[PDB]
């Protein structure tokens, strides 16, 4: 057609010693600072050593679909903010002398947060469900709660997120959340999750206690012990038959 004949492909090539290299993505090879390397080599080192089952058990958290329905239920039971607590008590304390008097008012069943609160609840069977976060960074504060909730016999679930439990108690993070009494309009939602949780945690907990974790190798190490196998496993089966 009528295209300009002065338009011309000049294809440069990128062999060795030829025209120089382009700006390709070097993101594997860069000099990272020593807080980034510190936390990437830390995450590799939790899968190179034998991780005991009291630390392994916070990896097999609850599935993404059925932990979402838990948070959808535990959203009506979030503790109140002070900005609703102050606005109530300007009218709730107003209703003593005008004109109720006692006003017992039936303290609503809400969530109870904190690992020191919810441990008191399970030791005397108050709890109904113990929601536990998986990535407490000093991971020794909840390493006894799957042990303790099995012996007391309440259901417990590991939930993928610490700041997602914290975002429903109006703080930054929250370690554990415990369900106690529930309203009668949605008690049936508890007898949908509890028999679906404790088949994963309580009914199989002797299985967890010998289920060691970690102890896999690098992708370079696991693929160098596949060439030595496939070199061995190409004539040793051919020797027979």
């Amino acid at each position: 057609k009528v295209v300009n004949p002065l338009f011309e492909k000049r294809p440069k090539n990128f062999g060795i010693g030829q025209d120089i290299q382009p700006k390709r993505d070097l993101t594997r090879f860069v000099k990272w600072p020593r807080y980034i390397r510190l936390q990437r080599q830390r995450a590799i080192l939790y899968k190179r050593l034998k991780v005991p089952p009291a630390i392994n058990q916070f990896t097999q958290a609850l599935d993404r679909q059925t932990a979402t329905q838990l948070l959808k239920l535990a959203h009506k039971y979030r503790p109140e903010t002070k900005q609703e607590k102050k606005q109530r008590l300007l009218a709730r304390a107003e209703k003593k002398a005008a004109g109720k008097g006692d006003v017992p008012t039936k303290r609503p069943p809400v969530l109870r947060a904190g690992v020191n609160t919810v441990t008191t609840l399970v030791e005397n069977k108050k709890a109904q469900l113990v929601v536990i976060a998986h990535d407490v960074d000093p991971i020794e504060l909840v390493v006894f709660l799957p042990a303790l909730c099995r012996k007391m016999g309440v259901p417990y679930c590991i939930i993928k997120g610490k700041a997602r439990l914290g975002r429903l108690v109006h703080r930054k993070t929250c370690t554990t959340v415990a369900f106690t009494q529930v309203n009668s309009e949605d008690k049936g939602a508890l007898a949908k999750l509890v028999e679906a949780i404790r088949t994963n945690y309580n009914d199989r907990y002797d299985e967890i206690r010998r289920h060691w974790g970690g102890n896999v190798l690098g992708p370079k190490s696991v693929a160098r012990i596949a060439k030595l196998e496939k070199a061995k496993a190409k004539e040793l089966a051919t020797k027979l038959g």
């Binding site: 700006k23 390709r24 993505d25 070097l26 993101t27 090879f29 000099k31 990272w32 600072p33 980034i36």
Partner: protein
């Protein structure tokens, strides 16, 4: 992707540095200009080699402060004597203080300026 590291080096990224806006000044008032026009010029020289330079060379000679430069001397003579200055030469004496040979313009002459000052 679509971020790309086209360098092997992690450089520290630049952040938002903002100017100060303090809740109170650290000093209550700006300090007074204690080297003013009257603190530049202390006293003239009336020596036999100073009067010999007022006549033949068309220049005044003062004893100035040691802290002053040739620009402050040229402005202080211009203010509190109402005379214009061509150039200023300065030296620090072995006495310790600084002598200034201020040369006037060819418009003026120092013989009828020293009459008004009264050093003659």
């Amino acid at each position: 992707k679509k971020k790309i590291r086209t360098s092997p080096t992690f450089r520290r990224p630049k952040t938002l540095r903002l100017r100060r806006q303090p809740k109170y000044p650290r000093k209550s008032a700006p300090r007074r200009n204690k080297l003013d026009h009257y603190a530049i010029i202390k006293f003239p020289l009336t020596t036999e080699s100073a009067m010999k330079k007022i006549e033949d060379n068309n220049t005044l000679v003062f004893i100035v402060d040691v802290k002053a430069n040739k620009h402050q001397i040229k402005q202080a003579v211009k203010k509190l004597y109402d005379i214009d200055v061509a150039k200023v030469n300065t030296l620090i004496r072995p006495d310790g203080e600084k002598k200034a040979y201020v040369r006037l313009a060819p418009d003026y002459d120092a013989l009828d300026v020293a009459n008004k000052i009264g050093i003659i």
